[PDB]
Symmetry: C3
């Protein structure tokens, strides 16, 4: 298309598409639970990447800046599902799952608001609050066979989720240090790893079984 970042968006679409199908066929045939959640994640990401590529999930924000809003719609559902996998994995109580999913909702809802805000400076305010929520989620993940995989995914989550605020911050969504074309690439590479990459470790693992 007429947009440089189309190929990354096309790439995200295919890669997320391929993973859903792969996860879909592997799942035939707790494990069920883990397959259910883990397949939904790239499946949802797949529709939002397609929406971004076709231009539906793109809007213009004055502060006129092109903002792909559709990833927040993605992240609103797929990140709590990712937390649930982890939660599942270690039999998290309902208190902690609730806490996590709530902070997650706050993390993404405020990121969206930051994304769509029309006063430049206020954007970072929302960035920080959202970061605070991320840091709480990461904190819960750390302080409160299976315990081996969990440590893996937890490390993966930490390294991958901590990259998003940075990319948004320096990217076209934030201070505009790095152009849209490049922050779209970074998000795609994070997203494929955080979801497809995350999925294979979990799903290729016997930790998911009773």
């Amino acid at each position: 298309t007429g947009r440089p970042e189309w190929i990354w968006l096309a790439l995200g679409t295919a890669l997320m598409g391929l993973g859903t199908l792969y996860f879909l066929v592997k799942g035939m045939g707790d494990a069920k639970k883990f397959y259910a959640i883990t397949t939904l994640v790239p499946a949802i990401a797949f529709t939002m990447y397609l929406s971004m590529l076709l231009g539906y999930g793109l809007t213009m924000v004055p502060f006129q800046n092109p903002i792909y809003w559709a990833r927040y719609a993605d992240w609103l559902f797929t990140t709590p599902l990712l937390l649930l996998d982890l939660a599942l994995l270690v039999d998290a109580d309902q208190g902690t799952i609730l806490a996590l999913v709530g902070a997650d909702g706050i993390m993404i809802g405020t990121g969206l608001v930051g994304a769509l805000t029309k006063v430049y400076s206020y954007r970072f305010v929302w960035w920080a609050i959202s970061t605070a929520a991320m840091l709480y989620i990461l904190y819960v993940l750390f302080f409160g066979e299976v315990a081996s995989t969990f440590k893996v995914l937890r490390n993966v989550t930490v390294v991958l989720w901590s990259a998003y605020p940075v990319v948004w911050l320096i990217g076209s969504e934030g201070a505009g240090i790095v152009p849209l074309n490049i922050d779209t690439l970074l998000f795609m590479v994070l997203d494929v790893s955080a979801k497809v990459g995350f999925g294979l470790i979990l799903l290729r693992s016997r930790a998911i079984f009773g």
Copy 2:
């Protein structure tokens, strides 16, 4: 009102209104669970039909085409609740419920996107993806007293849910073969049967009891 399809919208409102109340009084007095879910469904449909009739749930989409977006808001909640009844009925695991509700969310979210897309051809793309999700839900319903009712509702679901993609496809939302006035009528007749019609079979049945 100045719109031909007002009477179908008025009709949906009343019929969905009447059912909520009927379900509401019958429910006094697992069964509770089945009454809770089953009454919410026309209750929600009732507010969205009212919203369409008063014109709040109507918008214009260039590709300028009048689109009733409010039914997606309806379907986003009422179709997963319908799946839950079924799930309930056969003690579905949490894996399968999750799978179903996720594909359902994808089914409606993509339908909405198709509904609001401004490139004609892309609309059908979203139609197909949404159809794919429907076909997966229908597949789960089939392959994985009470077992008698369930077969009934399952047949009902299959016959009624399979009609929606067709009406959207040939209707004013899709190729525009059939005018808005008529696709509004078809959706109303499907909606009343899928919810009120569905509700009576389930609720007049002893399968709902322990």
Copy 3:
């Protein structure tokens, strides 16, 4: 800011901010569950109050009337969480929780629609329907150590939730008897009490423990 009601919005922000933190530190360290839900509530309210104050959660509605839509986004999540605390407290079945949360969703969704409607008279129609849903929730709360606290919070809920329809009705959202500046103050005072005020009674109580 240039808006009279900024100070109430600033006040809501701080007070809701302070409560989240307070609840956050107290929670370290069923109880977990009660802390999880109860801290999320002002935490969410905190972001929406901030959004209103910075102007993101404010819009203009013709019928041109300034409408703070962001509180519905707040109430959509925080009021069902408040109901859940109560539900928790008395071991409500899943049927009743579902019923309550569904009517709650209807209560707020219709209030929002009323809030955004462009035909003056229709607004009250949506007001009434939303009120009907409130009255059903209040009805469930009444007709179907711990039983002592519960009665307290239930009384509190009843007195505080019943005030919202009145303020909306006479306020700038409704008939415009009382100016925006004043209905913003009333909502803030209700919100802080319904959430922070509600939280302390519950959280300072041993009813939350096994």
